[PDB]
Design a protein around this ligand. Structure first.
Ligand SMILES: [Mg+2]
Ligand SMILES: [Mg+2]
Ligand SMILES: [Zn+2]
Lengths: 135, 176, 134, 38, 66, 94, 136
RNA sequence: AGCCAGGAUGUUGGCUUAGAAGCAGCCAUCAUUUAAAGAAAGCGUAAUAGCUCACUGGUCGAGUCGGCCUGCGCGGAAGAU
């Protein structure tokens, strides 16, 4: 038990949040100040974004249960997994603006429910519209 | 010793001569030769080097770990170079070279003339810094140490000969 | 590139103001009117932090911060001192109701998006300063 | 250097090393901490 | 000043330098300008004027014998 | 939950007891009830670790001698005067 | 400086110091300094060690001295010959056998208790060790 | 081990003090954000500033960390033909 059971717990809520989430973006957050990361976290919360940094070994087994086993493939380097529940993309757009604003914040891989969108194709999810447009 | 577990990868253009404990390395930079300890067995594997302890030697792995570091330094010295930067701090200290001989004015009543060993070169881009180039890490380190020992840096004002990488811990005086 | 805590409506008197910008080499009058503008726009007579960030290229920038929680809570409790023995003396009474307005005041400073969390942080400070909270 | 019978680490930056069968405390942060057992 | 056992009562900075106000015994303030100049490269000055009285320490009182 | 393995002593006396203590074991006695007292020899290290815990003197001990189990309680302990070692233990049948 | 208030006799034989000690267990406090060697503890040494540990505990908790110097030691003056009667009593000692608890304290953390006992034992002429109260 | 990052916000916790801003001393002993960040284990400053540590993430890819008994060794160890 002890830290092992703590990992047992930790994997549970992230797996369930991945079940309950809509879109997924994992990015590199190296050389970023906490006072800059805290502003990123506030912005994400104001738009329904759950972003957590966990051990890559834990997160591979966390996302095995989740649909994006495609996303599981790379998982190299620091990883800030963001679950864009609510409107599908609020996380990707914020990660793009935070990249140009704060250098070293690398977007890296992201997930469009099954298809592995690279860093050169995040624009599709960055430019998606809101869900309530039938009116 | 698990430094000795890691193999040393010899690059291309470098030859390795092994005659038991005595080894020789030649590269684009120069030539080095070293007699290894009798308690270490070296093996030239497929374009790489491996080290191990011989049987019947208490030292064994420690000697092997030392041997690996020496051969790695030799490989680096024969492929790339080893460089040392010396900085002179003071009102009138200056240096110059005349062919493997550095003349120094270190606030003395006499000039200081240091004769380099065989495989060491010294250049002075300015009158306040010295660049030492060589292939033998130990030899170039010794030469830099001797140059520093000519006038070790001074704790109250840093005046002397220091390394560029070195940080000199200063001091203060209350003048009683 | 410095910082300060000049009181509100007290930029004109230059006891440590003049020295500070004097060494930097900044004109007091220009900073004075500009700081005064905000210090008078708010409750005059209160230590207000200011991040005067003059760029060495003769720049002039300043970011006034919310007055510190220490002075806010001590004024709310009507006390001009602090608890010497926060566990024993514990003097000066406040109100949970009184924690909300100062929490709203300083919400621009903290990170948490929960007003109750803000009140729990400021009351954590209150227990340190030995204030009677109900 | 302090030559003593009892040589000890006076601060975290003090390190104990045996060099010639002799114990020496060397400090990278304070020369006054340098000791030898003798 | 602390070595001269003078209680410091002020550290008012200024555009020029720093003014420091303290209360120090006359007997132990003797010969002070020399050391002041030694500590400040002769780039500082002081003015001193009698303020009050206080009890001398027991060692000093014992030393004072007539 | 506290269980111990022990053997019946073959010789009693000061010399034999010191022989055991040198051989890393130590003696103990089990008495109480209708049964006659039983002198036992048992490992020192295992019982040292067991007695380290404060509960060693509260629960009912179990002693396995000659393949059978006896419920007892620790009654008295003789410790080495300065060394952290046990000289003797008294067990009363529970 | 501990010393008997009154004694039945001024002087007593040298005697011996054989055997192991009584008072092995921790009886009053929670932590104790137990002797490992054997020898004599002078009243000066006992009171010095007490000062040493009572200054370290910052006057916290309670401290018990389990020994008492009650054996008078006599000494002949300098430049006197042998005989002519026993010498004059000069100091008092407490005979110590291995396993004797010398000092005891309670009401302080164990970590601080070890430091206090270490400083106290630095003043003692015999080897000592740290013990804690046990349940038997 | 090392190496690359972060090591924060109320806040300069309160008292005392010329100054006490994590680090003179005295009383606590939090919450917020978190992956984690002590109302601080250091150095440093008159006080600031600054350099750290704990802690956490990355990298690395096999064992590693201390406490207890016990054997043999080491220093402590300077005299006169
Ligand atoms: Mg016998
Ligand atoms: Mg300080
Ligand atoms: Zn040190």
């Amino acid at each position: 038990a002890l830290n092992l059971q703590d990992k047992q717990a930790i994997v549970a809520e992230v797996s369930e949040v991945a079940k309950g989430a809509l879109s997924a973006v994992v990015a590199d957050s190296r050389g970023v100040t906490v006072d800059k990361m805290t502003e990123l976290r506030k912005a994400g919360r104001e738009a329904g974004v759950y972003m957590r940094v966990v051990r890559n070994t834990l997160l591979r087994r966390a996302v095995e249960g989740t649909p994006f086993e495609c996303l599981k493939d790379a998982f190299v380097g620091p990883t800030l997994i963001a679950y864009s529940m609510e409107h599908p993309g609020a996380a990707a757009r914020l990660f793009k603006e935070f990249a140009k604003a704060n250098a070293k914040f690398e977007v890296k891989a992201a997930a469009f429910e099954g298809e592995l969108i690279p860093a050169s194709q995040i624009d599709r999810l960055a430019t998606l519209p809101t869900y309530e447009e039938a009116i | 010793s698990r430094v000795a577990k890691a193999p040393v990868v010899v690059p291309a253009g470098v030859d390795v001569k092994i005659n038991g404990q005595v080894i020789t390395i030649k590269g684009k930079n120069g030539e080095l030769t070293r007699t290894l300890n009798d308690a270490v067995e070296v093996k030239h594997a497929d374009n790489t080097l491996t080290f191990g302890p011989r049987d019947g030697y208490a030292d064994g792995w420690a000697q092997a770990g030392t041997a690996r570091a020496l051969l790695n330094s030799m490989v680096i010295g024969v492929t790339e170079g080893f460089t040392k930067k010396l900085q002179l701090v003071g009102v009138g200290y200056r240096a110059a070279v005349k062919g493997n001989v550095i003349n120094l004015s270190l606030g003395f009543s006499h000039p200081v003339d240091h004769q380099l060993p065989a495989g060491i070169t010294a250049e002075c881009p300015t009158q306040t810094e010295i660049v030492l180039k060589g292939a033998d890490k130990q030899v170039i380190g010794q030469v830099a140490a001797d140059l520093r020992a000519y006038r070790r840096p001074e704790p109250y004002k840093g005046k002397g000969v220091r390394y560029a990488d070195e940080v000199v811990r200063t001091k203060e005086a209350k003048k009683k | 590139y410095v910082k300060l805590q000049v009181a509100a409506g007290m930029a004109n008197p230059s006891p440590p103001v003049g020295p500070a910008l004097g060494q930097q080499g900044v004109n007091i009058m220009e900073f004075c009117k500009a700081f005064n503008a905000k210090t008078d726009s708010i409750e005059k007579g209160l230590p207000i932090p200011v991040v005067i960030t003059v760029y060495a290229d003769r720049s002039f920038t300043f970011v006034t911060k919310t007055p510190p929680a220490a002075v806010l809570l001590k004024k709310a409790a009507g006390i001009k001192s602090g608890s010497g023995k926060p566990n024993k003396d514990k003097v000066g009474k406040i109100s949970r109701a009184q924690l909300q307005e100062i929490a709203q005041t300083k919400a621009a400073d903290m990170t948490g998006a929960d007003i109750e969390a803000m009140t729990r942080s400021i009351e954590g400070t209150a227990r340190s300063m030995g204030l009677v909270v109900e | 250097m302090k030559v003593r019978a009892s040589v000890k680490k006076l601060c975290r930056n003090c390190k104990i090393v045996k060099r010639d069968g002799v114990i020496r405390v060397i400090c990278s942060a304070e020369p006054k901490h340098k000791q030898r057992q003798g | 000043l602390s070595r001269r056992r003078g209680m410091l009562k002020g550290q008012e900075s200024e555009v020029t330098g720093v003014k420091i106000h303290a209360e120090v015994p006359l007997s132990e303030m003797f010969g002070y300008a020399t050391q002041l100049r030694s500590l400040t490269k002769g780039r500082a000055s002081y003015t001193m004027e009698f303020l009050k009285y206080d009890e001398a320490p027991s060692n000093v009182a014992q030393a004072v014998i007539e | 939950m506290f269980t111990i393995n022990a053997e019946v002593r073959k010789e009693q006396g000061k010399g034999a007891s010191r022989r055991l203590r040198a051989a890393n074991k130590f003696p103990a006695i089990i008495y109480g009830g209708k049964e006659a007292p039983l002198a036992i020899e048992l490992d020192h290290d295992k019982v040292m670790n067991m007695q380290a815990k404060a509960e060693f003197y509260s629960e009912v001990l179990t002693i396995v001698v000659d393949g059978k189990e006896i419920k007892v309680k620790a009654q008295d302990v003789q410790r080495h005067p300065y060394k952290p070692k046990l000289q003797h233990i008294d067990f009363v049948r529970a | 400086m501990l010393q008997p208030k009154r004694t039945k006799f001024r002087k007593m034989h040298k005697g011996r110091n054989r055997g192991l000690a009584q008072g092995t267990d921790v009886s009053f406090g929670s932590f104790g300094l137990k002797a490992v060697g054997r020898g004599r503890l002078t009243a000066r040494q006992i009171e010095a060690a007490r000062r040493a540990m009572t200054r370290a505990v910052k006057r916290q908790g309670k401290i018990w001295i389990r020994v008492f110097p009650d054996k008078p030691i006599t000494e002949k003056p300098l430049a006197v010959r042998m005989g002519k009667g026993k010498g004059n009593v000069e100091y008092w000692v407490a005979l110590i056998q291995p396993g004797k608890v010398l000092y005891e304290m309670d009401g302080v953390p164990e970590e601080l208790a070890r430091e206090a006992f270490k400083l106290a034992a630095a003043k003692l002429p015999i080897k000592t060790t740290f013990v804690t109260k046990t349940v038997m």
